[PDB]
């Protein structure tokens, strides 16, 4: 049942704000944690909220940062009463975009305190399902401390699953040069601890906001609200009940053919700005899932082979309209499956409309769909990181910072060897027999 969300670093914390704000809007929860009386009523959403005896609904979330600045805004803004202050953990000295600081030097000072506050939430749960980790790839805390927390969760909560929403870096909003270093280092130490990893290329969200919302330079709020829409569609299976609302844990069984190939590609549609008049059918929003301009990780699935394809519909969506659209796309596009896969599409439907932030930049839509596809083309993202990594590491540039914070230089080599094998593993999977 229950799910504990963990938000590490600025990216994880600031995205959790846009997510839990959207969660409250969808479930009708107010910033003070109060809801109207049921007047039963189908009240599924307790997998993400607990109940105080006084009728207060508190998120099962932990916000962690090595710097108080970001989380201080949380315990000051509109949702200061939503979370218990025990769930908002901060340090004083951050990691300075250094994985080794967040994982070895600074992060080890606060790792025991964080696991304690998590055990508090875990002991307030009658049946824990897993963890949802929200972090960046470039920041020192989002890369270093997250991979440290993932190592510790596998030791304590070994049975429970762990899903991560990672923020793939992009130069358009990049705040650090060594972000490729941190990305490779955290992807390596977390690869054997994560069950499913939804990467979010900031360049994709940046361009989708510029193209479909007509925003010149999107702010972090623009990116986060668009991301929160996708995260909501993924978690809606856990937070709502529905006759055709397939659980997310049932999609993972199809999305992950091998433990290392657990990086699905999410594609959300439609994304429309609130400026003119518009209503898209099921076939049009399903067609948009196969346009790479709508993906959240820049890559071309036509240059790769599929292993899974899952359609997470939400809104006014009828099953026969889905199968009609799928049959058209399957015989009018080029979806290459590997020759060892069943080639079938897994469909879930949630008849609640997609909620947007009021007065936001996203328009309320009748229906929407989030496609989760496990394609080999996502290995193009690893190649773009491995290349920027190779350019600097061949000169050992910026390495002294990491080695000066408890990390042995050979850990760079190990992490790159793993990424090299990960690229081979994606190459080998796409071959026929």
């Amino acid at each position: 049942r229950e799910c504990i969300s963990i938000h590490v670093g600025q990216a994880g914390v600031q995205i959790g704000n846009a997510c839990w704000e959207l969660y409250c809007l969808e479930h009708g929860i107010q910033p003070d944690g109060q809801m109207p009386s049921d007047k039963g009523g189908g009240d599924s959403f307790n997998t993400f909220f607990s109940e105080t005896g006084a009728g207060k609904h508190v998120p099962r979330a932990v916000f962690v940062d090595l710097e108080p600045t970001v989380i201080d805004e949380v315990r000051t803004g509109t949702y200061r009463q939503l979370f218990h202050p025990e769930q908002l953990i901060t340090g004083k000295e951050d990691a300075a975009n250094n994985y080794a600081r967040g994982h070895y030097t600074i992060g080890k000072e606060i790792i025991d305190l964080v696991l304690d506050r998590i055990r508090k939430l875990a002991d307030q749960c009658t049946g824990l399902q897993g963890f949802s980790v929200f972090h960046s790839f470039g920041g020192g805390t989002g890369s270093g401390f997250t991979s440290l927390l993932m190592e510790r969760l596998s030791v304590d909560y070994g049975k429970k699953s762990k899903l991560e929403f990672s923020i793939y870096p992009a130069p358009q909003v990049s705040t650090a040069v060594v972000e490729p270093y941190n990305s490779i280092l955290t992807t390596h130490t977390t690869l054997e601890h994560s069950d499913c990893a939804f990467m979010v290329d900031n360049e994709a969200i940046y361009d989708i906001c510029r193209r479909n919302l007509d925003i010149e330079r999107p702010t972090y709020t623009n990116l986060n609200r668009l991301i929160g829409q996708i995260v909501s569609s993924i978690t809606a299976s856990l937070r709502f009940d529905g006759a055709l609302n397939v659980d997310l844990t049932e999609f993972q069984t199809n999305l992950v053919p091998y433990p290392r190939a657990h990086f699905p590609l999410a594609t959300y549609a439609p994304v429309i700005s609130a400026e003119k008049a518009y209503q898209l059918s099921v076939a049009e929003i399903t067609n948009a899932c196969f346009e790479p301009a709508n993906q959240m990780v820049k890559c071309d699935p036509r240059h790769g082979k599929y292993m899974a394809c899952c359609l997470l519909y939400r809104g006014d969506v009828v099953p026969k309209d889905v199968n009609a659209a799928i049959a058209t796309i399957k015989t009018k596009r080029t979806i290459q499956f590997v020759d060892w896969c069943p080639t079938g599409f897994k469909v879930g439907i949630n008849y609640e409309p997609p909620t947007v932030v009021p007065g936001g930049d996203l328009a309320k839509v009748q229906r929407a769909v989030c496609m989760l596809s496990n394609t080999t083309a996502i290995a193009e993202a690893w190649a773009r990181l491995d290349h920027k990594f190779d350019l600097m590491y061949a000169k050992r540039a910026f390495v002294h910072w990491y080695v000066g914070e408890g990390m042995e230089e050979g850990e760079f080599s190990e992490a790159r060897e793993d990424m090299a094998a990960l690229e081979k593993d994606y190459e080998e999977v796409g071959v026929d027999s």
Binding site: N323, W340, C341, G344
Partner: protein, 430 residues
């Protein structure tokens, strides 16, 4: 050989099981309150098989099992959910994730002791336990994994009693997961060595019937479970109504199972009615016979033309000319002698019951031990190997304790079962 203990496991097991109890409780004149409101006395002649007393009315002898409490509440909220014993609901709150290993080895083994306690309880109030009856799905995680574990556990605690199962087959036409061939293969590997008789309920056949016969464009699980509950009511007719032929579980198994591993039955029945009110066809005896032995009415995706019938059990229901039944049942035999095994004399057996199912006046249920059932295992074995050659999705089974060799053995034993079904399909009388 009197009382039968019923067990339903998993999502599909509790779905088709609850629909089955709705059907027979009506035929036996039992309302959801448990009281008897029927008219004939045949309905109470052999009511002790599936029900108990409360001396304050009749209570089903059923045990409901699932690793997920979701189906538990949808059953109790159903129309007949208030008749089942509260203590007979044994449910964990974790789940199986559609993994056979999770249900059979990991989290189903940590719940199976709770079920055997309820099994033991219902078995003590039995003057003479006849056997057990299990409904489940082979392509899932709980019904497949924990179900086969329950079978093997009951086998070692009740080695005297018959183990009968109603197993439904996975199919890509109505599939929920890709690892269904894995689960079905691992489950068939258990049924072939643990169950005395097993009714193959192919979902691909149920789908094709709803689509190509009932002319339903998008069949739901209710459309499929209607054919299941009807098929289950027919093959159990001789067990709960006073009949002479195939009265108890063993006598049926002694007539239908010539070889121990070949206890997989191909059920069919007629007429094929939709979920509507009632039809006006009013089928004659020659029609009920032609419809029974037709592939379009088989609950298993196998063509009887491709194999030979080892044994056959036909069950007619409703007031009809029993003399006219013998002439038809004898006709189909001597007119299609190539599709009936010669080295088993009088392998076809026909029974008659005066009481029809509610909604019809004449019906007929078919039970066949055909060698064509190898097509069903060939189909599952094809999909199993397609993934197993690359060891796709195997980490979820190995992560729960299973060794890779268990997959090779289950695959091998299934292909041995196919070869044996072909072996007697080629044997002659000479």
């Amino acid at each position: 050989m009197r009382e039968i203990v019923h067990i339903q496991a998993g999502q599909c097991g509790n779905q088709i099981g609850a629909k089955f109890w709705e059907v027979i409780s009506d035929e036996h004149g039992i309302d959801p309150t448990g009281s008897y409101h029927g008219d004939s006395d045949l309905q109470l002649e052999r009511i002790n098989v599936y029900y108990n007393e409360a001396a304050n009315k009749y209570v089903p002898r059923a045990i409901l099992v699932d690793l997920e409490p979701g189906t538990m509440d949808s059953v109790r909220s159903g129309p007949f959910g208030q008749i089942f014993r509260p203590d007979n609901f044994v449910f964990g709150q974790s789940g199986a994730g559609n993994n056979w290993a999770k249900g059979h080895y990991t989290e189903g083994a940590e719940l199976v002791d709770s079920v055997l306690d309820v099994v033991r309880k219902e078995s003590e109030s039995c003057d003479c336990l006849q056997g057990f009856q299990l409904t489940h799905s082979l392509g899932g995680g709980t019904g497949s994994g924990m179900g086969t574990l329950l079978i093997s556990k009951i086998r070692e605690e009740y080695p005297d009693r018959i183990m009968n199962t109603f197993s439904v087959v996975p199919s890509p036409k109505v599939s929920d997961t890709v690892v269904e061939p894995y689960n079905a293969t691992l489950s068939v590997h258990q049924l072939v060595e643990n169950t005395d008789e097993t009714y193959c309920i192919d979902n691909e056949a149920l789908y094709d019937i709803c689509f190509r016969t009932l002319k339903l464009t998008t069949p739901t699980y209710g459309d499929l479970n209607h054919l299941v509950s009807a098929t289950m009511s027919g093959v159990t007719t001789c067990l709960r109504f006073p009949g002479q032929l195939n009265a108890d579980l063993r006598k049926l198994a002694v007539n239908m199972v010539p070889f121990p591993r070949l206890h997989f039955f191909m059920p069919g029945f007629a007429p094929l009615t939709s979920r509507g009110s009632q039809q006006y066809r009013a089928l004659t005896v020659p029609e009920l016979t032609q419809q029974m032995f037709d592939a379009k009415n088989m609950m298993a995706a196998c063509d009887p033309r491709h194999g030979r019938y080892l044994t056959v059990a036909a069950v007619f229901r409703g007031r009809m000319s029993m003399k006219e039944v013998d002439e038809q049942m004898l006709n189909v035999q001597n007119k299609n002698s190539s599709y009936f095994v010669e080295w088993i004399p009088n392998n076809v057996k026909t029974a008659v019951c005066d009481i029809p199912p509610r909604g019809l006046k004449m019906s007929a249920t078919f039970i066949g031990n055909s060698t064509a059932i190898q097509e069903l295992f060939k189909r599952i074995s094809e999909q199993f190997t397609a993934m197993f050659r690359r060891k796709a999705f195997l980490h979820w089974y190995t992560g729960e304790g299973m060794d890779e060799m268990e997959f090779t053995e289950a695959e091998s034993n299934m292909n041995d079962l196919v070869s044996e079904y072909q072996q007697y399909q080629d044997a002659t009388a000479d």
